[PDB]
Design an enzyme around this catalytic site. Sequence first.
Site, PDB file in Angstrom:
ATOM      1  N   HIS A   1       2.795   1.302  -5.363  1.00 29.76           N
ATOM      2  CA  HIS A   1       2.719   1.026  -6.530  1.00 29.76           C
ATOM      3  C   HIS A   1       2.018   1.399  -6.905  1.00 29.76           C
ATOM      4  O   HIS A   1       0.632   0.818  -5.862  1.00 29.76           O
ATOM      5  CB  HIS A   1       3.529   0.282  -6.984  1.00 29.76           C
TER       6      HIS A   1
ATOM      7  N   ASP B   1      -2.370  -7.784  -5.703  1.00 30.01           N
ATOM      8  CA  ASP B   1      -1.544  -7.269  -6.288  1.00 30.01           C
ATOM      9  C   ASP B   1      -2.741  -5.682  -6.581  1.00 30.01           C
ATOM     10  O   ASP B   1      -3.951  -5.041  -6.920  1.00 30.01           O
ATOM     11  CB  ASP B   1      -0.611  -7.077  -7.009  1.00 30.01           C
TER      12      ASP B   1
ATOM     13  N   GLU C   1       5.843   1.024 -11.337  1.00 30.34           N
ATOM     14  CA  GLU C   1       7.449   0.522  -9.993  1.00 30.34           C
ATOM     15  C   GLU C   1       7.308  -1.013 -10.524  1.00 30.34           C
ATOM     16  O   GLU C   1       8.656  -1.442 -10.157  1.00 30.34           O
ATOM     17  CB  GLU C   1       5.971   0.401  -8.875  1.00 30.34           C
ATOM     18  N   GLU C   2       6.127  -1.931 -10.944  1.00 32.83           N
ATOM     19  CA  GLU C   2       6.781  -2.791 -11.127  1.00 32.83           C
ATOM     20  C   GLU C   2       8.455  -3.019 -12.294  1.00 32.83           C
ATOM     21  O   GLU C   2       8.816  -3.642 -12.410  1.00 32.83           O
ATOM     22  CB  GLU C   2       5.760  -3.615 -12.148  1.00 32.83           C
TER      23      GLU C   2
ATOM     24  N   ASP D   1       4.732  -2.668  -0.834  1.00 32.60           N
ATOM     25  CA  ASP D   1       4.858  -3.770  -1.721  1.00 32.60           C
ATOM     26  C   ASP D   1       4.764  -4.760  -1.240  1.00 32.60           C
ATOM     27  O   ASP D   1       4.785  -5.388  -0.473  1.00 32.60           O
ATOM     28  CB  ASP D   1       5.906  -4.089  -2.908  1.00 32.60           C
TER      29      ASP D   1
ATOM     30  N   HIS E   1      -0.080 -12.395 -10.225  1.00 34.43           N
ATOM     31  CA  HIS E   1      -1.212 -11.683 -10.428  1.00 34.43           C
ATOM     32  C   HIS E   1      -1.689 -11.946 -11.947  1.00 34.43           C
ATOM     33  O   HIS E   1      -3.404 -12.189 -12.222  1.00 34.43           O
ATOM     34  CB  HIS E   1      -0.256  -9.590 -11.290  1.00 34.43           C
TER      35      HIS E   1
END
EC number: 3.4.11.-
Lengths: 353, 353, 353
Positions: free
Chosen positions: B68, B182, B212-213, B235, B323
């Site tokens: 991702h 990430d 993706e997130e 992930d 993040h």
Amino acid sequence: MEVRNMVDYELLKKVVEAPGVSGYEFLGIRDVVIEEIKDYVDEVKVDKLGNVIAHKKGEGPKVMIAAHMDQIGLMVTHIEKNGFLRVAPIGGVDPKTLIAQRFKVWIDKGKFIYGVGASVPPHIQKPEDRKKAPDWDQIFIDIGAESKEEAEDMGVKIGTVITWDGRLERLGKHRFVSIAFDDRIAVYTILEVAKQLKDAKADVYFVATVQEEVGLRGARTSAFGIEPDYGFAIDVTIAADIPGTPEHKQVTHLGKGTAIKIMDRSVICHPTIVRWLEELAKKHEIPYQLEILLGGGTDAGAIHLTKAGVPTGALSVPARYIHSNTEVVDERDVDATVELMTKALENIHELKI
Amino acid sequence: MEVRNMVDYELLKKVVEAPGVSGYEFLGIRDVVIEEIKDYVDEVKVDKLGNVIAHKKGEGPKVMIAAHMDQIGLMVTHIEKNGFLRVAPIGGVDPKTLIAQRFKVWIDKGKFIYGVGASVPPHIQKPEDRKKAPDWDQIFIDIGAESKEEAEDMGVKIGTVITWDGRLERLGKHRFVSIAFDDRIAVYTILEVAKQLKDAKADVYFVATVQEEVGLRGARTSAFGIEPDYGFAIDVTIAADIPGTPEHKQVTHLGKGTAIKIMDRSVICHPTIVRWLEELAKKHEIPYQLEILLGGGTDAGAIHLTKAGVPTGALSVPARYIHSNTEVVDERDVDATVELMTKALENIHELKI
Amino acid sequence: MEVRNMVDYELLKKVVEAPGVSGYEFLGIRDVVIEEIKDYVDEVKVDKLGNVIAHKKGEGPKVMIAAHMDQIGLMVTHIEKNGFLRVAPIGGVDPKTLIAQRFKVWIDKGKFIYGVGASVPPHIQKPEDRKKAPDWDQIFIDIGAESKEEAEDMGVKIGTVITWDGRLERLGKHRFVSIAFDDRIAVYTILEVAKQLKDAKADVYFVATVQEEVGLRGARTSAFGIEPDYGFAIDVTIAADIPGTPEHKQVTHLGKGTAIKIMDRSVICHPTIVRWLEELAKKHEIPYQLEILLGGGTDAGAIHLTKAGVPTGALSVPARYIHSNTEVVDERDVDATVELMTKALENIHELKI
Ligand SMILES: [Zn+2]
Ligand SMILES: [Zn+2]
Ligand SMILES: [Zn+2]
Ligand SMILES: [Zn+2]
Ligand SMILES: [Zn+2]
Ligand SMILES: [Zn+2]
């Protein structure tokens, strides 16, 4: 950058990057400040508290200008068995801002490692979950060490080692500086004044105190010998144009002109001085704002604790923020303070009442 | 730096610095990823969703590897009359971390200004004061503009423009990378695999999905044609050795080996694959950990939504963080994933069951 | 009425009066929609889900336009012994609005009786009394029957039978329509487009999905074959100029121009399309607004779930309200959407990227 060139980008950068906490490995800032001031002052001396006293020789009343340079920081209290660095609270720091990212932990002067510890262990409870405010335990910072031994090997020892860390960037190409607002700025204003000070109607002693944000009293000690016969100090705080904020607080700051401290927690500016400065600003057409604070103490107030019983005035640089998340400044504001303060110095002979 | 040289410092840096949100001005990352992958793959194509498909030609089953690259960010919803930039929430971001400092707002590709908006207007109430958790209004970011017109002039327009911004630093000289965890990493693992992939026992399609997130489904779309006949996605998430944390969560991560996803919210790893990978790791003496998550969905799960009904396995890189404040990674972890994944690719012919 | 004549009063009336819930006795709306569309389209087919597909023959890319026509309603779950009709919640309906008056319960197509059930049994407690929000039990509707047998005789059977019911009235003689905002409107926009569509640069498939407000996925199914190669969908939601509402939400709607969906819960409009539409609107001087939603999913997003992986754009009609109490629309808004959408259709050949 130097949109008006009133504030040199280089000088602002050197002071803001220097570590905060004189006498501490962050003491690099102390050396820097004296590095430049010595060129425009007859001499500079280091006091016992690490306070720096610049002596401007001239004839007239002794005017003491005091700028604070304690900044803010965090202190490691111990090393966890997991190799995580813990921290102890400092004052002038809001836990809510705790730390988000990139923290500078100084192992030694010139030796620092990046550490992060923005998150504190989650509380148990669906509602406590909402409580995102960390407990008094504050937050912890990881040096990335895996063991306490490793952390010690890293050179992490008890004692305030960490500084907020940040980068000087320009916000609003039209004007505005990032972490330039606290820490350095007032000190910058003092440096600029010395630089543009030519004809000294009155001799001005420049004192940079330490532990102003905390243990402001220590700052007063330097003020004790230098502050006699008048003094001025510059610290800044702002309620500034924030949304959801009432007009009554907006008036505190407007991002324009400068701010004269009418009264603070510790100093009730001598009315003549406050009023006088107002008169001076209008005469020279220098923009100014009247700001009153309900809390917060300034070094000027500390000066007021001198046994001399010397009155103190205060200059403020509008566009305040807190060090933990922001420190936006107004370029005009830095300029306004310097311009007004410089003219005031000569006027001080008559101005002294 | 490259303590083990397993992860090149340069490659990690280029990917982490590239803006997140392909197709968006942050799309620079999309171009970068294809810039390097094209050299080791026969060809790369851009899908309608902006997904990038790398085609490794070989003989054998089609194995799809999906990483991702949506990262996280914030979107401006409007311009306040005071010239302040407002923001709208994104998913995969925790408001509690909101923003502390230095935010990058992209006016255009290559054009960004620093903005800060870590503080949200204080609530009224002595107890609400304790509540440091911002409301859904989230926080606001100031571009430093003084007027909405100025903000518009700056080029600030509705649409996600802001990225978290950060700097890649080395934590623990012994190992550990900052915001490398990430965003990029898994993508890095995919790049490394392609680089070390020489003899292709099976042809591997590398797909980098977007959203993706958030909107992981979009990632599935690329998976739809490429993922047929098996696929793997990487992930990462971690409960890692944090103080005050129960051992039951500590086991989630240990900062060692790698983590094989036993099951996730959307994919229950096909037992044979999970078990098989375990067997493979032991045979090659590659360190691994079994990690199960109670929440969170992986792109691999998205692959599981293909009509093909292809089973999916997942690899995890331990040492997760969020993040907003941190993104510490274990250098060994990145290496472990790459090593295990590469060997698995050839084994996949037999491994496919 | 037809102040600008942009929206015919008759067409708006027929669609809004038709019952919502295709396939259901409310299915009368389904027949109506196809009744008019067949005259301007080459053919119309009914899908398995009751979705209606209109086929516009032309040369070029296939553009799918999808409008939702599920409306909202309530379902009777059982008959009370007192002859009262009970109800089960539906999604897209807010219990707080529950029902105030005049409810239409369809016993059969063309057979409905007025029923009321705006009040739910009072709770016990002086403070709960304040709680005027009904419990999950929702509210009950009385068909006026005195016995369950009588209710059954009335023909009341389990299954959603009740619709909100309302009347189309003109608010603000200057402009504004009542319950025209949801339910029909977007469908109206689709009809108008077909009517004014003459030269087909690209062939456009018009799909009216069902269960969009709930089970939007079903709508996607029709989209599956028709939506290939691009598609547009129109749903609407608004935070609109309400008092006590912050400016940040007011910007969501202004009752002017139209609204282009930058992003929604399920679809992140393909930036090129969103940006492109903006360009198109300016060129033709069509008013538009950029609207972003933090929640809510549109059928367009559903289209994004097609395996084709076709990008989707969305058009929004500002002046949103909720169906339970209001559904005010802006006449200009309906016109703006139609005008912009029609021009976009021809431009789509170049526009498709
Ligand atoms: Zn301070
Ligand atoms: Zn200060
Ligand atoms: Zn993430
Ligand atoms: Zn991730
Ligand atoms: Zn609705
Ligand atoms: Zn709708």
